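Batch job 17 of 40 flagged for manual review because the log was empty.
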Amino acid sequence: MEAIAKHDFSATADDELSFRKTQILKILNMEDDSNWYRAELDGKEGLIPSNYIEMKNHD
């Protein structure tokens, strides 16, 4: 499973994952939290805004 996120931001709280625009992020679980999503990166897990990403699986 893959999801993209284009926004270069620097998180506010420590449990807020920062990132770069157009980054390719790994997604862990989607469903009980449409607005808040749990993504993964290099092995580290974290909280972020699902609104800065979109599914790259149109097909």
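Reviewer: the log was empty due to a logging misconfiguration, but the result itself is present. The two ends are 14 Å apart (CA to CA). Unflagging and moving on to job 18.
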